[PDB]
Design an enzyme around this catalytic site. Sequence first.
Site, short mmCIF file in Angstrom:
data_model
loop_
_atom_site.label_atom_id
_atom_site.label_comp_id
_atom_site.label_asym_id
_atom_site.label_seq_id
_atom_site.Cartn_x
_atom_site.Cartn_y
_atom_site.Cartn_z
N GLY A 136 0.61 -1.42 0.20
CA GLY A 136 -0.08 -0.01 -0.23
C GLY A 136 0.73 1.14 0.13
CB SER A 137 0.85 4.06 1.76
OG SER A 137 -0.39 4.03 2.35
CB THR A 138 5.05 1.62 2.33
OG1 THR A 138 5.06 -0.03 1.87
CG2 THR A 138 4.91 1.52 4.23
#
Length: 420
Positions: free
Chosen positions: A163-165
């Site tokens: 995801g965001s990482t």
Amino acid sequence: LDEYSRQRGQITAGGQLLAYSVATDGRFRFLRVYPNPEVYAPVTGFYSLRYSSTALERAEDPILNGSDRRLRGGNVDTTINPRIQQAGWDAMQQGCYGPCKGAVVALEPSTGKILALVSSPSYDPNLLASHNPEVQAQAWQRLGDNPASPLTNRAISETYPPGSTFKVITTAAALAAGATETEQLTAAPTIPLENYPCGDEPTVSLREAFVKSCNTAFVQLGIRTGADALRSMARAFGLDSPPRPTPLQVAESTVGPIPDSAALGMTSIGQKDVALTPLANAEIAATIANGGITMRPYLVGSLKGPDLANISTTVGYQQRRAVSPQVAAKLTELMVGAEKVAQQKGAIPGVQIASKTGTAEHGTDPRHTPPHAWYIAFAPAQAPKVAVAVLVENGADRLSATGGALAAPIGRAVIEAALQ
């Protein structure tokens, strides 16, 4: 019968015993003992009469059983820092208003030493080391029937959408391709994907996009950069290449095929088919920390004879450069910024942390299942001694700026213990 009449060697960390064998009155003479069992199960594994062995008990079997040609059995000194491993474990048992499911990995960026390898929930290897047939079988059955799968080493054997990482990779790809930090990206709540509006303006700079929860900005940046560069950067950071043994096997991380611009948009924010182990996410942090050079992760620091004469000492090596020192410096700035914006639960006085916190949707219905919470980080940002990745399964919250905020205090407690 024969194997258990010789004293199997020890597995150690920082002068502490993780596994040893004791001479007993058993038909099988030596009982395997694990003195801090759930905490170190991902590192020790078990050594079982009925069910054989796992993890380091299996990987270093020749050394520990004394049959290795280089050679009481020999000893295995791990790279695990007990204070770090314990802090990861404790934080994972308390960090979800109670026990968390997921993983913590700690790496030394300059060497590649694995400082902590935590999986939760865990299990007691003493159960399987029992010389009672029935105690072993009942334990095997209960572990196998447990839906949380305590036998799984989630740090290295399971992959998850980052995801965001993964915006760290999207950004690296864009910066390597000449993108600037003042370049304007959309701040709209939706893009023809949704933000977990990015700000009160129609557009924000790349920097501001990185520090906040702006999926739409990164969809656009990823699409602007293109699939060629995104795949190539993912490969630079070790994705889609079979990992080397640690000597434990690590599952392969992947970016997925990326068939069209829609899939490219989704990949750029760590969804679609992107799947990483927690170790691979910690390596990304450690690579940035180490000025763009990825060091090969290793878990065994040295091997010793029964007399503790040294048989082998692991050599640290530079796997590959993922990014220029300049791009690594820019990513570092951005990650210091992302840490600064976050609410400071578990902040260390006088210690600057570089991080990326966020969420990852998953499962057959990602829009309703609680997303994962991730935190990847390194510290001190300007001369790094530790890199961490925290995965909390289904840990995403609906109130914080990034939704991943529960993973962050776990990561910070691990860093605190590392820097002490």
